[PDB]
Structure formats: C-alpha cells, structure tokens
Write a protein that binds this ligand. Structure first.
Ligand SMILES: Nc1ccn([C@H]2C[C@H](O)[C@@H](COP(=O)(O)OP(=O)(O)OP(=O)(O)O)O2)c(=O)n1
Ligand SMILES: [Ca+2]
Ligand SMILES: [Ca+2]
Length: 511
DNA sequence: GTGGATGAG
DNA sequence: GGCTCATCCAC
C-alpha cells in the first residue's frame, strides 16, 4: 500500500508501438463483426438489423443473422431445414461467377429454395464469389487504421487494436474529456500529470496511488465483475476504463459509416480479448479487468481446449497427457503448478520419457516442451501476451472449382473456367496492392486438375508480362497453354470429365 | 516435392 | 454439411 503496484517504466511503454503489449498496463482489443456475411447481405438489400436474413451458398447456410437465431437456426443447416423453423426466413445467396464470364453477379430472388425452376443457381456451372465480403472488410479496416496506430487483421472480420498510445495520451494530455459535472480528467488527474512533465522520477520508481477522484471514471460496456469487485483500484483500471471509452467510439464509427454491429473484448492480453469478444453477442463489449481474470477464466465456459490453437487434437492430447479433468481444467493446470513454468515443464519432460506414446502419433515436440509449459502456465492465469504482429506477405493465391457432373467435359470447358479464375485472381491482386500499397504481380502461374478417376495433373511455369503488365490477360494466356498441354498429356487415359480444376499464382515481386 | 494433417473462418 | 487460408512434415 501507500504506493501504486505499477511503475513509470510500465506506464510509459504504452507509448512505444513495439513494446506496449508486454507492459502490465497494456490495453488490447479484439473486434469481431457479428454474422458478417449475413450482415453485409442485409445492408446490401436495405433490410433492417432485426430481419431474419441468412447467407446462403448452394444449399447450406454459411452466415446466420442473430434475428434468425431466435428460431433455432444454426450455421450449415440446410435452407430446407431452416425454412421449417422460420417460414419467413430471408435467404440471400452469395454473388456468383458463371462459367465463361469474367465477372461475378448477384441473382437476388433465385435459389434452390425457390419453386420457379427458371430462377436457379446451378452449382454445376457457377462459382461462389466472396469479393463482396472482401470489400466491406477492407472498408472497416481503413476506418480501424484511422483510429488506431496498430491494427492486426486476424481474419476477414476480426482485428486486434493496441490502444496504448491513445490511452496514454488521453491519460496525460486530454483536457476536453468530462467524468461528470464540474470535473475534468485534467483536474482529477493532477498529481500524476504534474509529476510526469516534472520528470523527476526514475523509470523504475512506483507510480503514486490513483487519486480518489479518478474513481468516478466509468467503463463503457459490460464489466465482467461476478465477485462484485471495485471497478477502479489502480492505473490498469484507469487505462482500461479510458480504453473502453475510446473503443466504443471506434465501433460506433463503424455502425455509422458501414452499419455493421460488432462484439468487442478488452483486457491486457490478446488471448483474453479473443475470449471476451466472444463472451457476449451480438453488439456487445465485454471488459475483463486484471483482477477478474481468474474469475473470468473460471466462469465455467472455458477449458484448455477453449484457448487458441488448442481446440483440436493437440488439445484433446494435453488433457489425456497432463491428466486434466473435463471440468474446470484451466483452474486445475494453474493449481497443480502454482510455482512456475518449471514445475509443469519437468512434468512433461518426465511424461514424455516413458511407455505412454511414440514421437510419431504425437503433436508435442519434446525439444520445445519448455515453451509449452510457460505458455500453458501463463494462459491459465491470463497473462500470455502476444505482440500484435502484422500479417506476413502473401505467398500465393488460388482460385478453384470442385467440379461436379459433366461440366468441365472438354478443353473449351476448361478454358471457360479459366476465364473465371483469372477475373477473380486479378480482382484479388488489386485488393493486395491496396493493403501493401505497393505494386504486386505474379511471376509464375500453375494449373492443376483431377481426372474422372481423381488422378492429379499439373503444369507450372513462369508468366511473362510485356507492354502494360496486364495481369488479367497474359495470365489467362499462359493458363490456356498449360491447360492445353495437359489435354494432350492425357489423350487415351482417364481424364474427362474433370473433377477439380484450379489456377494458382506464386513468386510475387513486391516492387 | 506435395498430399494430407491440423486449426479456424 | 461447403469451401477458403496458412503453416508444417513424413513418405
Ligand atoms: N466454417 C465457417 C466459419 C465462418 N464462415 C464465414 C461466415 C462469416 O461471415 C465469416 C465470419 O467468421 P465467424 O466464425 O466469426 O462467423 P459469424 O460472423 O457468422 O458469427 P460470429 O460473429 O458469432 O462469430 O466467415 C464460413 O464461411 N465458414
Ligand atoms: Ca470468431
Ligand atoms: Ca464474426
């Protein structure tokens, strides 16, 4: 007591873009668009957020609006099943490419669920286009980057934000913000601000106890506080409070510009944010204070298999290995080794040197069992902070069509599909340049397919650009040759009807 | 050198 | 259940 637990070094780190995630006062955020595809189709057709709309692909549902979820409809239910749950369901099929044409289109009012035999989208000669979701995604991304100086795109509809710089500056220099009436952050946070500019402190000194007045700062969103704890006790709570405020603005910016609802999760770690953002949906914001991490991790909805990269076999193994139960496993891993990663480390090292398994059907890499320990240790305590890295440069881009029926039955048929794959790849190449803001062009194409008997043929080679680097024509030119050379390689062999056909581009010159 | 595994969208 | 993405490694 009589002094804040944290130090200046830790608070200042929020200003550094490369060392802000390690800080204890770190304020990360994860934002996941609710029923994305379902939402975008809703917005496109000018429907309301409460409409039972659903994104359809062929016969399956790939996106379920929360409005339609009240009818018990779930992802991947066949349209037929859904309609038996909500006869007033509003199914919308994704845009599609028609064999031969170089552009995708929306066939609203058409679908397998439609009686009229004319209005149909035969999967036989159609390719799903995900471009619409791409664009919208790209938009939300530009708004995110304009509000935060560090955004990690985890997926097509997910992003992580490092509110470090914002919270810090807001904490030390914002003079507009109001907490209540006749009270501003500047006057409520005088000591700390006046001690900061003074700079008569040592980076390793401890921060002054938060001012009794700052406790009137309110959190924006749901603060996961089951054990009914004090919302504001130290700076991490202040930083988190401001963070939640700032965060609300950004999200609203999205609902206002694009009209997409979202769920968000704040905490001092990417992993906890990931869980928090999923805790409540739709259009919510779960806030996990550091002093509520365990209460949260032990609420009863998570498991070791509920964390990141552990929801698969690697997860089901760690259970049968560490001899973990099937309930309150996170609280377990924590209590069986409440000293340090070393405890659990030597436990694995000892559990791997016996007649329990072989180094073949296992997912653990013994020479790295030291990390696995430190990881699980931290994860079980909600302190495994990963840096908000950036998505690595793209290596390749494929565009295929798992052929069904006698669609691709000849060479021209192959070509017709090639036209589609190029139109799409070309489209995706532009989207790439927009992200890297640098010219991107494939230096090599590749054609592969699967014969009637499922055999694999494939020709790879370099694509040459001469004139205006038309990465939307010469690409197809090479594709045709290749698909034609393969047509010759299998003349009196099992070949047509092809069962699969795909075009891929690699070796990119990010000049 | 890749078809599968693995994990999540 | 359909289909897109990004490692990583025995055979
Ligand atoms: N097996 C899956 C999982 C997801 N998606 C698509 C549907 C969504 O538009 C986008 C989003 O991924 P989510 O898993 O986050 O799906 P939702 O947006 O539908 O629901 P929620 O926001 O509750 O996660 O990816 C898909 O085609 N196939
Ligand atoms: Ca998700
Ligand atoms: Ca989502």
């Amino acid at each position: 007591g009589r002094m804040s637990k944290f130090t200046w070094k830790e608070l200042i780190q929020l200003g550094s873009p490369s060392k802000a995630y390690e800080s204890s006062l770190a304020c990360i955020a994860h934002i996941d668009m609710n029923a994305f595809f379902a939402q975008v189709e809703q917005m496109r057709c000018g429907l309301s957020k409460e409409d039972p709309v659903v994104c359809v692909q062929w016969n399956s549902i790939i996106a379920v609006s929360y409005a339609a979820r009240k009818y018990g409809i779930s992802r991947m239910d066949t349209i037929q099943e859904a309609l038996k749950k909500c006869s007033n369901l509003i199914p919308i099929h994704t845009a599609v490419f028609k064999k031969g044409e170089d552009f995708w289109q929306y066939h609203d009012g058409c679908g397998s669920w439609v009686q009229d035999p004319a209005k149909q989208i035969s999967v036989e000669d159609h390719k799903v286009s995900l471009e619409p979701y791409r664009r919208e995604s790209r938009k939300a991304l530009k708004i995110f980057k304009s509000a935060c100086d560090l955004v990690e795109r985890a997926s097509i509809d997910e992003v992580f934000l490092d509110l470090g710089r914002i919270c810090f500056n807001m904490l030390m220099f914002d003079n507009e913000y109001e907490l209540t009436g006749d009270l501003k952050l500047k006057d409520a946070l005088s000591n700390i601000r006046e001690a900061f500019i003074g700079g008569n402190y040592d980076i390793n000194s401890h921060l002054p106890l938060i001012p009794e007045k700052i406790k009137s700062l309110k959190f924006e969103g749901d603060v996961f506080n089951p054990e009914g704890r004090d919302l504001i006790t130290d700076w991490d709570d202040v930083i988190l409070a401001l963070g939640s405020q700032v965060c609300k603005g950004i999200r609203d910016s999205i609902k206002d510009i694009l009209g997409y609802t979202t769920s968000c999760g704040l905490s001092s770690t990417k992993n906890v944010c990931k869980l928090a953002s999923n805790y409540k949906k739709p259009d919510a914001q779960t806030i996990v204070k550091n002093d509520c991490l365990l209460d949260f991790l032990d609420c009863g909805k998570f498991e070791i298999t509920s964390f990141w990269t552990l929801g698969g076999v690697l997860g089901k193994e760690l259970i049968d290995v560490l001899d973990l139960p099937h309930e309150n496993s996170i609280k377990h891993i924590r209590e069986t080794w409440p000293d340090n990663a070393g405890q659990l480390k030597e436990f694995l090292d000892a559990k791997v040197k016996q007649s329990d398994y072989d180094r073949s059907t296992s997912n653990i890499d013994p020479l790295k069992t030291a990390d696995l320990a430190e990881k699980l240790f931290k994860l079980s305590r909600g302190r495994y902070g990963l840096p908000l890295s950036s998505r690595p440069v793209v290596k390749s881009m494929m565009s295929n069509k798992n052929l069904r029926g006698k669609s691709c039955n000849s060479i021209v048929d192959c070509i017709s599909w090639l036209e589609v794959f190029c139109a799409e790849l070309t489209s995706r190449i532009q989207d790439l340049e927009q992200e890297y803001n640098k010219i991107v062009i494939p230096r090599t194409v590749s054609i592969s397919l699967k014969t009637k008997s499922y055999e694999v043929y494939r020709k790879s080679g370099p694509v040459a650009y001469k004139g205006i680097n038309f990465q939307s024509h010469e690409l197809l030119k090479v594709g045709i040759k290749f698909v034609t050379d393969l047509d010759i390689k299998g003349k009196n062999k099992s070949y047509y009807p092809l069962t699969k056909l795909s075009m891929t581009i690699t070796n990119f010159d990010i000049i």
